Amino acid sequence: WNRKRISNCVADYSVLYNLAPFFTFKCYGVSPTKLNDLCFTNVYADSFV
């Protein structure tokens, strides 16, 4: 697993909500519509098939 420790940035997922080739958006612990105003130390990104 490639744990990408992304830091020192603000989440901007509203592009993916505004584009066709991204389909599912599920969030647990935080709201799926309230993602933009959250701040984190290290977001751990993983991407698989």
Partner 1 sequence: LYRLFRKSNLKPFERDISTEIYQAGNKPCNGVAGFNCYFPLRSYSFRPTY
Token pair of 46 as six digits: 């993983």
Distance (Å, whole) CA 35 – CA 12: 8
Q: Minimum distance from CB of 11 to partner 1 (Å)?
A: 17
| 41 contacts partner 1 (rule: CB under 8 A) | no
Q: Report whether 36 contacts 13 (CB < 8 A).
A: yes
Q: Distance from first CA to last CA of the chain, Å, rounded?
A: 12
Q: Mark residues 16-35: x for contact with partner 1 by CB under 8 A, - for none.
A: -xx----xxx-----xxx--
Size of the site for partner 1 (CB under 8 A): 8
Residues that bind partner 1 (CB under 8 A): 17-18, 23-25, 31-33
